[PDB]
Design a protein around this nucleic acid. Structure first.
Length: 40
DNA sequence: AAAAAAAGAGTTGACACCCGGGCGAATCCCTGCTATAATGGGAGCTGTCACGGATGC
């Protein structure tokens, strides 16, 4: 799917979500969608 | 099963500034006054008709 090319901070869900995503060092949505509940 | 904080709000002083209103100064517009003698004017058709009307005796 072409949606994976978009960055993780391209949806602006919330401030805490952006903070934890930046702390996790994620650039693509695939690494976040793969981890369902373990890494979350 | 409990219990406090980055944001989210809410302000509180602390500059940075940006046209406005005066203070100047430098400079525009008006108006009148000049003392020998000045003394009637320059284009323009004029190589279309024909009609339809307005004056005159």
């Amino acid at each position: 799917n072409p949606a994976l090319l978009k960055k993780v901070d391209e949806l602006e869900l919330s401030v805490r979500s952006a903070n934890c995503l930046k702390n996790d060092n994620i650039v693509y949505i695939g690494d976040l969608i793969q981890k369902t509940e373990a890494e979350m």
